[PDB]
Design a binder for this molecule. Structure first.
Ligand SMILES: *[C@H](CC(=O)OC(C)C)n1cnc(-c2cccc(Cl)c2)n1
Lengths: 212, 106, 751, 85
C-alpha cells in the first residue's frame, strides 16, 4: 500500500494508528510510514499521539525519528498539545526526548500557560499538578506577568495566583539554570541515555532528567 | 541607573555596584575600603585605556544595559610600587575544559 | 402452540432469506425501491418487533434456533438503519423492550450473554442519531423512548458507552466527522446519559469530555461553529449539576462564562445562557450562599455586586429569568437576617426604578398616561413577581415596601381604564395603552396571589394586607364594564380565602356582594365568552364554600339562593370540568350544611326537592356518565340523610306526611315520568335498593349503574360508555405503574 | 562587610557578605573561604549569579535570562550543587 498516501480527509494512516494503538504505529513505521507525515493542517502523527495521551505510541514514534519539535500552522509542538490536557505520561516522554518547553504558538501560548489555564478551570487532578511541577522543573524559569499582571483568568483563583506570582518573582536557583543549559546542549536526543556518559555524580545525572 | 563592575588586578577581583551618575573617585574610595590603598597610588583602566577619577561612570562608557549583574563591565586596576605604577596585569580565568562529545552541537 | 410460532418464524425467516440477503443494504433498498418495497420493509419491522416482544423468550428457549434468532437480530440492526420516522420508531420500541428485558434480568446472567457481544452496535447506533432533546408530540415521544433505551444500555455496560462517546468526540476534534449535526446529536447523547454512571466515573467522563470540547472550541474558528459548540457545552454542563457541586471552582468558572455569554449577540446564545444559568441556580442554590473552601465571601454577594453589569444587554424575559435564578439562590440563605440583607441588595435596582416612577406620579399623576411609564411599571412588577415566586415567604420584606404604592398605582390605572371606556366605548380594549394598564393590573394581582399563596402568617395578612386590597379591587370590579373585569381578581380572592380561612370570613359578605352577581351574569350564558372568569369564579366559590361555609349562613338569603342556582347551573353544565366542579361544590355544601343544624331545616325544606329533581334529571339524561359514581355518592348521601331522619320534619311542602314516605313517592313520580315504560313494581324494587344501599356507596354505585344500563338496553342505546369511569382508572393505573417502574432506574427522569 | 572566596587556581574574589549568604553552603561555613575544587571560570560565574539573584529577587519586572555558556554549564551545575544555591 501507499502508506504515505493521503486519504480524502488528507490524513495519513499513521495519524490513525497514533490515535489507536502502538502495535499499528510500529507496523506502519516498520513499513516506512513517514513519521514526519503532515496532515491538512501539518499536525504530525506525534501531535495526535500526544493529544490522545497515547504514551506508548508517542514513544514508538519518537524512538523512530519523529521530529519532537514538529510544528503545525499554529506552531504548536506536540508538547503544546500534551500540556493543554496536562496529561503527564506524554509530557514526561517528550521531555525525555528533549522536547523544548520554551515554545510559543502564534496565538501566544506556551505549554505552561495552557496548563495553568487548565488548572484555573479546576479540572486539575493530582496528575495535572504533577505535570505542572514537571514542566516547571523542565523550563528552569518561566514568566506569566504581562504588564506586571497575571492573565485575567488566573486572577479568579487567588491561591493559584499567589503560587504562580511567587514562582515568577523568584530568579530561580543556579542549579536549575545549569540543568536547563545542560539539557539544551544535549539537544534532540534521548536524554536519559545521553546523560549516562557525562562526568557527573549520579544524583546529578538523575537531577538532569528532572527526577529530582 | 545601576552599574555592575568587576575590578581586577593580578589574581584579585572585586565585585561592586555604583550609580551611573557616580564618579570613578568614589569607586577608588570603595577600593580604599577593601584594600586600604590610598586613591593616588591606584589607577583604573577601561579596556586598555586609563581614566580620570573625576569623570562620571556614565561618561566612562558604563551604562545600565552595558553593565548587567550577569555580565559586569571589567575594569583594570594597578597600584604604585616604590612610588611607581606597576604595569597592568590580569590573569585570565582558566579556560573551560573540552565540551563532551555527547554535548557537542548537532 | 409454541412450536407453531417457532415454525412460522423459522420457515418465514427461511423465506425472507431468499427475499433479502443479510448483506443487502436495507436503507439503500428503501431509498431506491418502489413503494411496495418500503411497505415490505415496514411490515418486516412490524413482524419482527411484535413477535419478539411476545416470544423472544420462546426462541431463547429453543437453543437449536439460537443462530437463526441471532440472524434475525442482524436484520433487526439493518432495518434499524432505516431513517423513516415510523420504521425507526418501531425498531426503537423493540430496542427499548429488549433493554428493559435485560436490565430486569440483572440491574453475567444465563441469557444476557446472548446479546452482549454486539449490543455495543445498538449503543453506537443509538448514540449516533439521537433525536433532539428540548435543547431549544412525536419529538417528546421519540426523545423519551430513546433516553430510556440509552440509559438502560449504559447501566448494562458503562465502559463501552463512555468509550464510544469519547471516540466520537475525538473524531469531532479530529475533524474526520466534524458536522454541526453530528456534534449536536453526540452532545445530546452525552447529556442524556446524565446520572446513569457512578459519581467518580461521571467525574472522569466529564473531565475528559469538557477538556475535549474546550479544545475543539479553541481549534474551530468562525462565530457560527464557535456558537454551536458553546451551546452544546452549556447543555452538557447544565445536565450535570452533581459534577458542578463536586467542583466548586469549575462551577464558578462556568457561571462567569455564562455572564460572558449574556453579553454575546450571536443568535440565541443569550437565551441558552440564561436558561442554563437558571437550570444551575435551581439545583446548586446552596453552594452560592455557603462560603466555599477558600472563599472570603459567598458568591451570591459577588453576583449581586456585579448584577448591574451582568444584565447590561439582556432582553426583558432574559432579565426576568436572571432575577428568578438569583431568587432561587437567595432562597437558600437560612439566616433570616442575612437573607433579609440579600433580598434588600437584590431588589435595589427595581426598587430604585419603582421609587422614581412613584415619585414622578405623586409630583403629577399625569405621568401614568404614558406608554413608557406603564411599560416600565409592567416590567418592574414582572420582576417582582418572579422574585416572589423564587424567594418565597421572606419576599414579604420587599412586598411590604411597595404594597401601598402598588395599590395606589392600581387604583389610578383603573380610573384611566374606566375613563377611557366611558369616553370612547368598550372597543378601547386592545388599544395598546389600555392593554398596558390591564397588564399592570394583572401583574399586581399575580404578585399578591403568589405571595399570599406562599405566605404562612394568616393573622398578619388579614391585618395589614387584605383590607387595602379589597378596598382597591372589589368596587373597581363591580363598576367596571365587563371587558374591564380582570379574572385575576377572582383568583386572588380565591387564594386569599384558601389561606386566611376564618380570618377572612367577616369579609366574605362584601366580597360576594361586590363580585358574585356582577360576574355570574357574564358567565351563565353558553360558553367561551368569558372562560377565565368562569374558571376563577368556580374556584372562588369552591374555596369560600369549603373554608367559610358559615358566611353562606350570614350572607343575605337572596344572594345565597342565587348561589344555589349558580351551582345547579354549574353541575348541570355539559362540559366535564364545569360539571365536575359543580358536583364537588354541591357535595361539599351538603356535607357542611349537616353541621350547624341551626336554620338547616329551612335549607333542607327549601332546596332538597329542587336539587333532587336536577340530580335525577342529569342522571337519567346520562349526559356526563363520568359523574355517575359521584352522583351515586351524593344520591346515597341524601338517602342516608332522609333515612337517618335528619330532616326531623314533614318535608312534604306545608303538609303533615313525614319524610321518606313522601320522597319515595316523589322519586316514583319523576322516574315514571322519565320512564313511563318502567313498571311500578320496578320502581318499588329500585327505590328499595336505593334506601338499602344508601350506606353501601360502592354497591349503591353498582346498583345505579345496573339500572341505567337496563334503561339503555330498553332504549337499545350504547351501554359501554357508562363504564368509562372504570377503564379510565384502569388506564391510569397502568400509567402509574409505568411511572413507578421508571423511578427504579437512575437517569430516566431528568435531574 | 566583604567576604573573600578563593578558587582552586588561587584567584581571590571579594563579594558583599549579604550577597555571599545567598549560598547556603557559605551561610553554614561562615571572613575568608577557600575552595579546593572550583576553578576560577566557574566561581566567577557563581559570584555573577549571586549578584543577579540579589538584584532580581522578588522582581516586579520580568527577570532577564542568566547567560550560561554550554562549556561552563557542566561545571557550574556541580559548583551550584556543592554550594547549595
Ligand atoms: C467557546 C469559546 C466561546 O467563547 O464561544 C463563543 C462565545 C461562541 N468556549 C470555550 N470555553 C467555553 C466554556 C467553558 C466552560 C463553560 C461554558 Cl458554558 C463554556 N466555551
Amino acid at each position: 500500500a501507499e502508506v504515505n498516501a493521503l486519504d480524502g480527509y488528507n490524513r495519513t494512516a499513521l495519524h490513525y494508528a497514533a490515535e489507536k494503538d502502538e502495535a499499528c504505529v510500529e507496523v506502519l513505521l516498520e513499513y516506512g510510514a513517514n513519521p514526519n507525515a503532515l496532515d491538512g493542517n501539518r499536525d504530525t502523527p506525534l501531535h495526535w499521539a500526544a493529544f490522545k495521551n497515547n504514551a506508548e505510541c508517542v514513544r514508538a514514534l519518537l524512538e523512530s525519528g519523529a521530529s519532537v519539535n514538529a510544528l503545525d500552522y499554529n506552531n504548536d509542538t506536540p508538547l503544546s498539545w500534551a500540556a493543554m490536557k496536562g496529561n503527564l505520561e506524554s509530557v514526561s516522554i517528550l521531555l525525555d526526548y528533549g522536547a523544548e518547553v520554551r515554545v510559543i504558538n502564534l496565538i501566544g501560548q506556551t505549554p505552561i500557560s495552557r496548563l495553568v489555564a487548565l488548572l484555573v478551570r479546576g479540572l486539575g487532578t493530582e496528575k495535572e499538578d504533577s505535570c505542572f511541577e514537571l514542566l516547571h522543573r523542565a523550563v528552569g524559569h518561566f514568566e506569566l506577568r504581562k504588564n506586571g499582571t497575571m492573565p485575567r483568568e488566573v486572577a479568579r483563583d487567588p491561591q493559584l495566583c499567589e503560587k504562580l506570582t511567587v514562582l515568577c518573582s523568584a530568579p530561580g536557583t543556579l542549579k536549575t539554570l545549569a540543568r536547563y543549559a545542560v539539557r539544551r546542549s544535549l539537544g534532540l536526543q534521548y536524554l536519559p541515555d545521553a546523560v549516562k556518559g557525562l562526568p557527573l555524580p549520579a544524583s546529578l545525572k538523575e537531577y538532569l532528567l528532572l527526577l529530582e | 541607573m545601576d552599574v555592575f563592575l568587576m575590578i581586577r588586578r593580578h589574581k584579585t577581583t572585586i565585585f561592586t555596584d555604583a550609580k551611573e551618575s557616580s564618579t570613578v573617585f568614589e569607586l577608588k574610595r570603595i577600593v580604599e575600603g577593601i584594600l586600604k590603598r590610598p586613591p593616588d597610588e591606584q589607577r583604573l583602566y577601561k579596556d586598555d585605556q586609563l581614566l580620570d577619577d573625576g569623570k562620571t561612570l556614565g561618561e566612562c562608557g558604563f551604562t545600565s544595559q552595558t553593565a548587567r549583574p550577569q555580565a559586569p563591565a571589567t575594569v583594570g586596576l594597578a597600584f604604585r610600587a616604590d612610588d611607581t605604577f606597576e604595569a597592568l596585569c590580569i590573569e585570565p580565568f582558566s579556560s573551560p575544559p573540552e565540551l563532551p562529545d555527547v554535548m557537542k552541537p548537532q | 402452540y409454541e412450536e407453531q410460532f417457532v415454525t412460522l418464524f423459522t420457515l418465514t425467516m427461511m423465506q425472507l432469506k431468499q427475499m433479502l440477503p443479510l448483506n443487502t443494504n436495507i436503507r439503500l433498498a428503501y431509498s431506491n425501491g418502489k413503494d411496495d418495497e418500503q411497505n415490505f420493509i415496514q411490515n418486516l419491522s412490524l413482524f419482527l418487533c411484535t413477535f419478539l416482544k411476545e416470544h423472544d423468550q420462546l426462541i431463547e428457549k429453543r437453543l437449536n434456533l439460537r443462530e437463526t434468532l441471532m440472524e434475525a437480530l442482524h436484520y433487526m440492526l439493518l432495518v434499524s438503519e432505516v431513517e423513516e420516522t415510523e420504521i425507526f420508531k418501531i425498531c426503537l420500541e423493540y430496542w427499548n423492550h429488549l433493554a428493559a428485558e435485560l436490565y430486569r434480568e440483572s440491574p453475567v446472567p444465563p441469557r444476557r450473554q446472548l446479546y452482549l457481544p454486539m449490543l455495543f452496535k445498538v449503543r453506537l447506533l443509538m448514540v449516533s442519531r439521537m433525536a433532539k432533546p428540548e435543547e431549544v408530540t412525536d419529538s417528546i415521544n421519540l426523545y423519551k423512548n430513546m433516553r430510556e433505551t440509552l440509559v438502560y444500555l449504559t447501566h448494562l455496560d458503562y465502559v463501552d458507552t463512555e468509550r464510544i462517546m469519547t471516540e466520537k468526540l475525538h473524531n469531532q476534534v479530529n475533524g474526520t466527522e466534524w458536522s454541526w449535526k453530528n456534534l449536536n446529536t453526540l452532545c445530546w447523547a452525552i447529556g442524556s446519559i446524565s446520572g446513569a454512571m457512578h459519581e467518580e466515573d461521571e467525574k472522569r467522563f466529564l473531565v475528559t469530555v469538557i477538556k475535549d470540547l474546550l479544545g475543539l472550541c479553541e481549534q474551530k474558528r468562525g462565530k457560527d461553529n464557535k456558537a454551536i459548540i458553546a451551546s452544546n457545552i452549556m447543555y452538557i454542563v447544565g445536565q450535570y449539576p452533581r459534577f458542578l457541586r463536586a467542583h466548586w471552582k469549575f462551577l464558578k468558572t462556568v457561571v462567569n462564562k455564562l455572564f460572558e455569554f449574556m453579553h454575546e449577540t450571536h443568535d440565541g446564545v443569550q437565551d441558552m445562557a440564561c436558561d442554563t444559568f437558571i437550570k444551575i441556580a435551581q439545583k446548586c442554590r446552596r453552594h452560592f450562599v455557603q462560603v466555599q473552601v477558600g472563599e472570603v465571601m459567598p458568591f451570591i454577594d459577588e453576583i449581586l455586586n456585579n448584577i448591574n453589569t451582568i444584565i447590561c444587554d439582556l432582553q426583558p424575559q432574559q432579565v426576568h429569568t436572571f432575577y428568578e435564578a438569583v431568587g432561587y439562590m437567595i432562597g437558600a440563605q437560612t439566616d433570616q437576617t442575612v437573607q433579609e440583607h440579600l433580598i434588600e441588595k437584590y431588589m435595589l435596582l427595581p426598587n430604585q426604578v419603582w421609587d422614581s416612577i412613584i415619585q414622578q406620579a405623586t409630583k403629577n399623576v399625569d405621568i401614568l398616561k404614558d406608554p413608557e411609564t406603564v411599560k416600565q411599571l409592567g416590567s418592574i412588577l414582572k420582576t417582582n413577581v418572579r422574585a416572589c415566586k423564587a424567594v418565597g415567604h421572606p419576599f414579604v420584606i420587599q412586598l411590604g415596601r411597595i404594597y401601598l404604592d402598588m395599590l395606589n398605582v392600581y387604583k389610578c390605572l383603573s380610573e384611566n381604564i374606566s375613563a377611557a371606556i366611558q369616553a370612547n366605548g368598550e372597543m378601547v380594549t386592545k388599544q395598546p395603552l389600555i392593554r398596558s394598564m390591564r397588564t399592570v393590573k394583572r401583574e399586581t394581582l399575580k404578585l399578591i396571589s403568589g405571595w399570599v399563596s406562599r405566605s404562612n402568617d394568616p393573622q398578619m395578612v388579614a391585618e395589614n394586607f387584605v383590607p387595602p386590597l379589597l378596598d382597591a379591587v372589589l368596587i373597581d370590579y363591580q363598576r367596571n364594564v365587563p371587558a374591564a373585569r380582570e379574572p385575576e381578581v377572582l383568583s386572588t380572592m380565591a387564594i386569599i380565602v384558601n389561606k386566611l380561612g376564618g380570618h377572612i370570613t367577616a369579609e366574605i359578605p362584601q366580597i360576594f356582594d361586590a363580585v358574585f352577581e356582577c360576574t355570574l351574569n357574564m358567565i351563565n350564558k353558553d360558553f367561551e365568552e368569558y372562560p377565565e372568569h368562569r374558571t376563577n369564579f368556580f374556584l372562588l366559590l369552591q374555596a369560600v364554600n369549603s373554608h367559610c361555609f358559615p358566611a353562606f349562613l350570614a350572607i343575605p338569603p337572596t344572594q345565597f339562593k342565587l348561589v344555589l342556582d349558580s351551582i345547579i347551573w354549574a353541575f348541570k353544565h355539559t362540559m366535564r370540568n364545569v360539571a365536575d366542579t359543580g358536583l364537588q361544590i354541591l357535595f361539599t355544601l351538603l356535607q357542611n350544611v349537616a353541621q350547624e343544624e341551626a336554620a338547616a331545616q329551612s335549607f333542607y325544606q327549601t332546596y332538597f326537592c329542587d336539587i333532587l329533581q336536577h340530580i335525577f334529571s342529569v342522571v337519567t339524561d346520562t349526559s356526563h356518565t363520568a359523574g355517575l359514581t359521584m352522583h351515586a355518592s351524593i344520591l346515597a348521601y341524601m338517602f342516608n340523610l332522609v333515612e337517618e331522619g335528619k330532616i326531623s320534619t314533614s318535608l312534604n311542602p306545608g303538609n303533615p306526611v313525614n319524610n321518606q314516605i313522601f320522597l319515595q313517592e316523589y322519586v316514583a313520580n319523576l322516574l315514571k315520568s322519565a320512564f313511563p315504560h318502567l313498571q311500578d313494581a320496578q320502581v318499588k324494587l329500585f327505590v328499595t335498593g336505593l334506601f338499602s344501599l344508601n350506606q353501601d356507596i360502592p354497591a349503591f354505585k353498582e346498583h345505579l349503574r345496573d339500572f341505567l344500563v337496563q334503561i339503555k338496553e330498553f332504549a337499545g342505546e350504547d351501554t359501554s360508555d357508562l363504564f368509562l369511569e372504570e377503564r379510565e382508572i384502569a388506564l391510569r393505573q397502568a400509567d402509574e405503574e409505568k411511572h413507578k417502574r421508571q423511578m427504579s432506574v437512575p437517569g430516566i427522569f431528568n435531574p | 562587610m566583604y567576604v573573600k572566596l578563593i578558587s582552586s587556581d588561587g584567584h581571590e574574589f571579594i563579594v558583599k557578605r549579604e550577597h555571599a549568604l545567598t549560598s547556603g553552603t557559605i551561610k553554614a561555613m561562615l571572613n575568608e573561604v577557600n575552595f579546593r575544587e572550583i576553578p576560577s571560570h566557574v566561581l566567577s560565574k557563581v559570584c555573577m549569579y549571586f549578584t543577579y539573584k540579589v538584584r532580581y529577587t522578588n522582581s516586579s519586572t520580568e527577570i532577564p535570562e542568566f547567560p550560561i555558556a554550554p562549556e561552563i554549564a557542566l561545571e557550574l551545575l556541580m559548583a551550584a550543587n556543592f554550594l547549595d544555591c
